[PDB]
Write a structure and sequence with these properties.
- It is an enzyme of class 1 (oxidoreductase).
- It comes from Synechocystis sp. (strain ATCC 27184 / PCC 6803 / Kazusa).
- This is Putative diflavin flavoprotein A 3.
- Mediates electron transfer from NADH to oxygen, reducing it to water. This modular protein has 3 redox cofactors, in other organisms the same activity requires 2 or 3 proteins.
- This protein has 11 helices and 18 strands.
- With 406 residues, it is of the alpha/beta class.
- The protein has 2 domains: 254 residues, 4-Layer Sandwich (Metallo-beta-lactamase, Chain A), CATH 3.60.15.10; 152 residues, Flavodoxin domain (Rossmann fold), CATH 3.40.50.360.
- It has a 7-stranded mixed β-sheet. Strands 13, 14, 15, 16, 17 and 18 form a 6-stranded parallel β-sheet that branches. The chain has a 5-stranded mixed β-sheet with strand order 8-9-10-11-12.
- A hairpin with a 3-residue loop joins β3 and β4.
- α5 runs antiparallel to α6, α7 packs across α11 and α8 packs across α9.
- The longest helix has 23 residues.
- It is globular, with a radius of gyration of 21 Å.
- The protein starts with a strand and ends with a helix.
- The protein binds chloride ion.
- The site of chloride ion has 7 residues, from loops.
Length: 406
């Protein structure tokens, strides 16, 4: 059917707004099963009123249109963001126009992101940054506790626990890209493949950070996960959590590892990066994703120190690689053994000099390449993703073949 908004009360003072699409809307590897998805927003309306995670650009108008019929936006006290990017920021611009009195609640990395993203926008709602174990009291027992859960792809990711309802708002964790009529997740098997595919595409390349996240979240006795995507997790909560632990364990246990350094979390190059990573991990080789923009030097050193191969992904900005790609390049060259397998990819408009620069520097530095350098002009398509995935697989096979020779 057409996109819609499914509304359901889910706990005291708490409502979910599921923006639903039955069709795939973006060419990103995680929508590969083409089972649709949902973008979930949550409203806690107590003494104070908080809205979690307005949906992105595809959903902006249905969502705001629907919300306004259920709520005077002038009474909105808080907008809580589990993660931030330009797509979500688009909806925020409109929502905050209608709710100028609201305060933005988010993590420190998200705040930094949002300040750039809304730099030229008129909206100037205040931002209140939340750190681990900070609280926000909505009244009526809804004293929220916040838990930062950063990953390369979601540097500003922030989970929230509501002790009144025992709901953990988990953002990108524990979800599934599947559109259905069920607001809750009764039935294990129908969601198993979606949940595993979701983990594999989104979380496997961040196995250590995701494990660190789940360790923190253990401290909260939640009976429901309220994720960004798919049904709420109530009936499958324990089983899915045990599965995540096992999957995380097997990722970090794999013999070979690839350091996958890409320029930033969101954008065409990032889309390519997730596709390549999935090709590697499905082939039984671990991936440590590195967001050059938000990563520090020790992260990059440690990744390169334990990897069998590394891959750079970069856009071209004014004829050059982004500064974070240039500095990551220096750290990589200063630390990588020439036995490491190398790879280069990227997207570009009409100039792709960043890709040429990287290919040349790695070739001059004596590295062998694990796939032919990937150059994608303008927006990735379905076959783009499959090609990148296949390149990742090729890279993985090359690593396994060379390792078997010891
Ligand atoms: Cl984020």
């Amino acid at each position: 059917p057409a996109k819609d908004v499914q509304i359901c009360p889910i706990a005291v003072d708490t409502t979910v707004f599921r923006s639903r699409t039955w069709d795939r809307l973006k060419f990103e590897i995680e929508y590969g099963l083409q089972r649709g998805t949902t973008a979930n927003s949550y409203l806690i309306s107590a003494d104070k009123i908080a809205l979690f995670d307005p949906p992105g650009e595809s959903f902006t108008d249905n969502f705001v249109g629907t919300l306004i019929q259920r709520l005077d936006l002038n009474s909105l006290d808080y907008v809580i963001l589990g993660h931030v990017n330009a797509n979500r920021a688009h909806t925020l611009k409109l929502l905050l126009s209608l709710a100028p009195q609201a305060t933005i609640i988010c993590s420190n990395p998200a705040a930094q992101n949002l300040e750039k993203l809304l730099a030229d926008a008129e909206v100037n709602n205040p931002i209140q940054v939340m750190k681990g174990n900070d609280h926000l009291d909505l009244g009526r027992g809804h004293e929220l506790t916040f838990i930062p859960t950063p990953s390369p792809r979601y540097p500003g990711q922030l989970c929230t626990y509501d002790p009144r309802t025992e709901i953990l708002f988990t953002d990108k964790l524990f979800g599934a890209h599947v559109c259905g009529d069920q607001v809750f997740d009764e039935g294990w098997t129908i969601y198993q493949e979606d949940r595993r595919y979701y983990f594999d595409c989104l979380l496997a390349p961040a196995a250590a950070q995701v494990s660190a996240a789940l360790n923190k979240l253990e401290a909260y006795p939640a009976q429901t996960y309220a994720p960004s995507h798919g049904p709420l997790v109530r009936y499958g909560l324990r089983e899915l959590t045990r599965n995540y632990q096992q999957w995380l364990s097997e990722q970090q246990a794999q013999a070979l590892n690839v350091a996958l350094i890409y320029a930033s979390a969101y954008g065409n190059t990032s889309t390519l990066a997730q596709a390549i990573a999935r090709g590697i991990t499905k082939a039984g080789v671990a991936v440590t994703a590195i967001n050059a923009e938000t990563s520090n030097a020790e992260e990059i050193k440690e990744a390169i120190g334990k990897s069998a191969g590394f891959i750079f992904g970069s856009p071209t900005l004014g004829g050059h690689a982004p500064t974070p790609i240039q500095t990551a390049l220096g750290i990589t060259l200063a630390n990588a053994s020439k036995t490491q397998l190398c790879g280069v990819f990227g997207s570009f408009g009409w100039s792709g000099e960043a890709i040429d620069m990287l290919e040349n520097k790695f070739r001059d530095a004596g590295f062998s390449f694990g796939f032919d350098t990937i150059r994608v002009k303008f927006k990735p398509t379905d076959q783009t993703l499959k090609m990148c995935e296949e390149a990742g697989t090729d890279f993985a096979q090359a690593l396994k073949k060379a390792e078997k020779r010891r």
